[PDB]
Tab-separated table of N, CA and C in Angstrom:
chain	number	residue	atom	x	y	z
A	1	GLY	N	7.290	-15.821	-18.494
A	1	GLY	CA	8.954	-15.379	-18.591
A	1	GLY	C	9.704	-16.860	-18.272
A	2	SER	N	9.742	-17.496	-19.134
A	2	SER	CA	10.755	-19.285	-18.820
A	2	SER	C	11.187	-18.555	-19.910
A	3	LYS	N	11.223	-19.715	-21.042
A	3	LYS	CA	11.784	-19.675	-21.803
A	3	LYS	C	11.454	-18.356	-23.179
A	4	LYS	N	12.936	-18.455	-24.522
A	4	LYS	CA	12.731	-17.805	-25.323
A	4	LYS	C	12.380	-18.090	-26.806
A	5	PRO	N	10.771	-18.248	-26.679
A	5	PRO	CA	10.732	-18.351	-27.800
A	5	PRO	C	10.219	-17.569	-28.703
A	6	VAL	N	9.984	-17.759	-30.330
A	6	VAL	CA	10.027	-16.810	-31.380
A	6	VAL	C	8.842	-16.711	-32.699
A	7	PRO	N	8.272	-15.735	-32.098
A	7	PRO	CA	6.978	-15.012	-33.375
A	7	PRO	C	7.017	-15.369	-34.786
A	8	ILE	N	6.247	-15.150	-35.789
A	8	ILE	CA	6.171	-15.086	-37.119
A	8	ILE	C	6.345	-13.586	-37.917
A	9	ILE	N	7.152	-13.899	-38.339
A	9	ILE	CA	6.676	-12.932	-39.663
A	9	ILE	C	6.722	-12.364	-41.034
A	10	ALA	N	6.243	-11.782	-41.317
A	10	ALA	CA	6.309	-11.976	-43.121
A	10	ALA	C	6.622	-10.835	-43.840
A	11	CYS	N	7.450	-11.876	-44.940
A	11	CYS	CA	8.703	-11.323	-45.430
A	11	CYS	C	7.863	-10.386	-46.943
A	12	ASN	N	8.917	-9.596	-47.585
A	12	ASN	CA	8.289	-8.641	-49.364
A	12	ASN	C	9.114	-8.822	-49.254
A	13	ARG	N	8.646	-8.656	-50.799
A	13	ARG	CA	9.654	-8.448	-51.452
A	13	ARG	C	9.704	-7.103	-52.434
A	14	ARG	N	10.122	-5.967	-51.080
A	14	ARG	CA	10.755	-4.969	-51.383
A	14	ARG	C	12.228	-4.639	-51.317
A	15	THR	N	12.405	-3.449	-50.963
A	15	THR	CA	13.779	-3.472	-50.208
A	15	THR	C	14.134	-4.243	-48.976
A	16	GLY	N	14.534	-4.606	-49.330
A	16	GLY	CA	15.438	-5.451	-47.780
A	16	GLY	C	14.206	-5.711	-46.696
A	17	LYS	N	13.078	-6.383	-46.671
A	17	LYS	CA	12.517	-5.569	-45.430
A	17	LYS	C	11.191	-6.772	-45.025
A	18	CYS	N	11.299	-7.226	-44.204
A	18	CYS	CA	10.257	-8.690	-43.177
A	18	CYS	C	10.188	-8.344	-42.054
A	19	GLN	N	8.381	-8.480	-41.613
A	19	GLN	CA	8.871	-8.250	-40.440
A	19	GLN	C	6.851	-8.644	-39.847
A	20	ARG	N	6.256	-8.620	-38.930
A	20	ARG	CA	4.926	-9.613	-38.655
A	20	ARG	C	3.976	-8.295	-38.645
A	21	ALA	N	3.094	-8.155	-39.338
A	21	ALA	CA	1.534	-7.718	-38.953
A	21	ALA	C	2.022	-6.911	-37.931
């Protein structure tokens, strides 16, 4: 608990939906 990083997510070619596994 120090900094506020950001993971990676996968986008989808459908109903505005994007997220990681």
